[PDB]
């Protein structure tokens, strides 16, 4: 897991549970079976109706993009593109093929393959930008599942509470327990709001943050391959690519 998510979950549990215990309570009074089944079951139902089945199989991959550690290999590639620049300058474009064959980055490998095949500069720009646009769209689709789960969850909490209160309207005759009865009913709304705000919308926001980092790295590889095709000098190549790395 990401260290920020681990510390965030620790802080979140201490805030909510510690707050409840400080005003006075038991944690066993904050757990309900039926409220969990209505809120989570209802959210899951609304998401499954909302999306085709193939999207839901992407949901596993969505969490892997969010919680993955930051490998941060961008710097390594910035060097390589600079080095390819120097090879292209002395040796000619055929040497770029032999340099690139076994590079662990596919997008870079394909970009260089288009330049060694001698394609004209607007065409290599067009094909590589279509790959970037496809990755932008893919990551947005993962995030949208979690954003939509976060918008149904609070309303499912309301359905939960109103179902609780309908049962209580059958026991209004006993005034002593009406009060404790209403409290148990409210538990569902606490789940609806709390799950949306802590779990669902944070996972969506973290997906969108990590997508933006990865798209920058792709755009650098795009300016890198167009720069080596233009035949810029190594100092100018380094200066352009440096604008991307933070």
């Amino acid at each position: 897991m990401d260290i920020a998510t681990l510390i965030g979950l620790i802080a979140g549990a201490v805030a909510i549970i510690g707050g409840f215990l400080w005003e006075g309570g038991q944690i066993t009074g904050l757990f309900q079976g039926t409220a969990a089944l209505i809120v989570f079951g209802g959210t899951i139902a609304a998401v499954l109706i909302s999306y085709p089945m193939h999207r839901i199989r992407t949901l596993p991959a969505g969490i892997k993009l969010a919680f993955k550690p930051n490998r941060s290999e961008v710097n390594e590639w910035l060097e390589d593109i600079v080095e390819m620049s120097m090879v292209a300058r002395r040796e000619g474009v055929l040497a770029l093929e032999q340099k690139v064959l076994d590079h662990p980055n596919i997008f870079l490998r394909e970009g260089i393959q288009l330049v060694v095949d001698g394609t004209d500069q607007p065409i290599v720009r067009q094909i590589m930008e279509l790959d970037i646009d496809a990755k932008e769209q893919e990551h947005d689709n993962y995030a949208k599942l979690f954003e939509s789960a976060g918008s149904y969850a609070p309303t499912m909490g309301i359905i939960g509470t109103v179902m609780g209160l309908i049962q209580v309207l059958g026991h209004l005759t006993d005034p002593s327990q009406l009060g404790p009865s209403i409290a148990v009913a409210f538990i569902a709304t606490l789940y609806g709001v709390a799950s949306a705000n802590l779990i669902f919308l944070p996972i969506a926001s973290k997906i969108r943050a990590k997508s933006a980092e990865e798209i920058l790295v792709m755009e650098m590889i795009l300016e890198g391959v167009l720069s080596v095709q233009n035949g810029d000098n190594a100092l100018l190549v380094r200066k352009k690519l440096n604008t991307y790395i933070t």
């Binding site: 609070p154 309303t155 909490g157 309301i158 509470t161 209160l165 209403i182 709304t189 609806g192 709001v193």
Partner: protein, 34 residues
């Protein structure tokens, strides 16, 4: 969304309102039988 809190707040307030408008109504009814 910025204003996502108001959706839940208007739901909670509404439930509260129903409770007092039900009590108020009971208080008049009790005062009538008393």
């Amino acid at each position: 969304p910025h204003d996502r809190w108001m959706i839940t707040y208007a739901d909670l307030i509404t439930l509260l309102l129903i409770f007092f408008v039900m009590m108020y109504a009971m208080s008049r009814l009790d005062a009538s039988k008393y």
